[PDB]
């Protein structure tokens, strides 16, 4: 590419894109973490008998 004197680049990061993806990621973690809790109680019921 062609150089340009007296200039600098931005971060090419869009806060609107990143913030919404953080909402989606958090729910995926909780939904996965729900499975661990469910599996623990499945084993918990079996042990107590």
């Amino acid at each position: 590419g062609k150089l340009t004197n007296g200039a600098l680049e931005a971060s090419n990061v869009d806060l609107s894109k990143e913030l919404v993806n953080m909402i989606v990621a958090q729910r995926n973690y909780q939904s996965n973490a729900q499975t661990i809790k469910t599996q623990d109680q499945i084993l918990n019921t079996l042990v107590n008998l």
Binding site: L3, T4, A7, L8, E9, S11, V13, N28, T35
Partner: protein, 100 residues
């Protein structure tokens, strides 16, 4: 069933961690945002082994140039890099344009 869930739990954490990294490095000059990608894994058939991280890729779309004044700076309009050398003889490639 912990094996499937724990692997998925780690994958979600890694995805969240990368988002935090992309959101903290904002306003950095020579920075390209990165995203992670996953891929399932089955031992044979009908059996699931969870999910693993399939590498982290960086989007090299050029950012918007800024007229920060000064004389000892330069931004590359298109694809390209600056070649930098360390005192030990290593070679490092950078996109930032802060020179002193």
């Amino acid at each position: 069933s912990f094996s499937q869930a724990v692997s998925g739990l780690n994958a979600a954490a890694t995805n969240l961690d990368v988002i935090g990294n992309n959101i903290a490095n904002s306003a950095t000059y020579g920075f390209k945002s990165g995203t992670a990608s996953f891929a399932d894994m089955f031992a044979g058939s009908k059996v699931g082994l969870g999910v693993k991280v399939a590498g982290i890729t960086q989007d090299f779309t050029d950012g918007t140039t800024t007229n920060t004044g000064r004389g000892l700076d330069v931004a590359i309009s298109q694809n390209g890099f600056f070649r930098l050398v360390d005192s030990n003889g290593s070679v490092f490639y950078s996109r930032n344009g802060q020179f002193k």
